[PDB]
């Protein structure tokens, strides 16, 4: 019945929060992490530097913070509506799977691809590696999935909010800029300026 692919960004798309930040202030280093943005932004260095600010953070805490992010309204509703229309629903995140694994199960996403916060003796050791370590990581994984599930660009829908989602926007027919930054809105097929994911259903 026609197989389709839907990919969601995580931070500020599914959850009305930025994982690395909620993590930062939970450990009391938000004011430092907030300023770590190296640059035409270097996503890789910025990310690994912020993560290091988390050295020694106990895992139970990090896991608690990551599994408690607030979702945007319509989240579940949107995802169920997509699945009932033969959509494979996936989530891409420059964030971490402590977060993405939880929401993948909660929203019944078919898959989630993010990075891992390396743990040593029950605490974060400040290191990170994974699927989304570079700024063009989403576009790449999208091509991977399309070739894997054998779904075309024409049958792909993408939803994100930041500059980082551009690499994903390139290989999609439907591009939704959800409460997005100027750069992303300007390449979108549709813009949603209201904090409710259900608004996307009419699509």
Which residues fall within 8 angstroms of residue 187, CB to CB, at 6 or more apart? 166, 169, 175, 177
Residue 11 falls in the annotated catalytic set: yes
Cβ neighbours of 152 (radius 10 Å): 12
Which residues fall within 8 angstroms of residue 66, CB to CB, at 6 or more apart? 19, 22, 23, 96, 98, 99, 102
Place of tokens 């896991």: 63
C-beta closer to Cl ion: residue 14 or 107:
14
Place of tokens 């690499």: 167
97 binds Mg ion (CB under 5 A): no
Q: Is 31 known to sit in a ligand binding site? A: no
Q: Is 110 known to sit in a ligand binding site? A: no
Residues 66-125 within binding reach of its own copies (CB under 8 A): 88, 90, 110-111, 113, 116
Residue 122 falls in the annotated catalytic set: no
Segment near Cl ion (CB under 5 A); pick from 16-24, 103-111, 135-143, 166-174: 135-143
> Are the beta carbons of 123 and 135 closer than 8 angstroms?
no
- Smallest gap, in angstroms, from Cβ of residue 23 to its own copies? 20
56: tokens are 């020694």
From its own copies, Mg ion, Cl ion, none, interface partner of 161 (C-beta below 5 to 8 A by class) = Mg ion
Which residues fall within 8 angstroms of residue 74, CB to CB, at 6 or more apart? 196, 197, 198, 199, 200, 201
From Cl ion, Mg ion, its own copies, none, interface partner of 90 (C-beta below 5 to 8 A by class) = its own copies
- Helix, strand or coil, per DSSP, at residue 198: helix
Binding its own copies (rule: CB under 8 A), the pick from 32, 56, 60, 148 is 148
4 binds its own copies (CB under 8 A): no
Chain contacts with its own copies (rule: CB under 8 A): 88, 90, 110-111, 113, 116, 129-131, 133, 144, 147-150
Q: Which residues bind Mg ion (CB under 5 A)?
A: 9, 11-12, 161-162
* Binding-site entries: 9, 11, 161
Which residue ranges make up the annotated binding site for Mg(2+)? 9, 11, 161
């Amino acid at each position: 019945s026609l197989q389709k692919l839907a990919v969601f960004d995580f931070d500020s798309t599914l959850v009305n929060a930025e994982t690395i930040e909620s993590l930062a202030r939970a450990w009391g280093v938000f004011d430092e992490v907030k300023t770590i943005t190296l640059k035409e932004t270097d996503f890789h260095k910025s990310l690994i530097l912020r993560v290091s600010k988390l050295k020694n953070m106990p895992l139970k805490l990090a896991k608690e913070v990551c599994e408690s992010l607030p979702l945007f309204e319509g989240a579940l509703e949107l995802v169920s509506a997509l699945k009932e229309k033969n959509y494979k629903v996936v989530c891409f995140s420059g964030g971490f799977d402590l977060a993405t694994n939880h929401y993948r199960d909660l929203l019944h996403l078919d898959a989630a691809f993010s990075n891992t916060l390396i743990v040593e003796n029950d605490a974060l050791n400040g290191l990170v590696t994974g699927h989304m370590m570079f700024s063009h990581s989403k576009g790449e994984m999208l091509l991977v999935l399309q070739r894997l599930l054998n779904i075309s660009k024409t049958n792909t829908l993408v939803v994100g909010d930041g500059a980082n989602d551009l690499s994903m926007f390139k290989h999609a027919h439907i591009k939704i800029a959800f409460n997005a930054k100027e750069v992303l809105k300007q390449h979108a097929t549709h813009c949603i300026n209201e904090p409710d994911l259900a608004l996307i259903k009419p699509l």
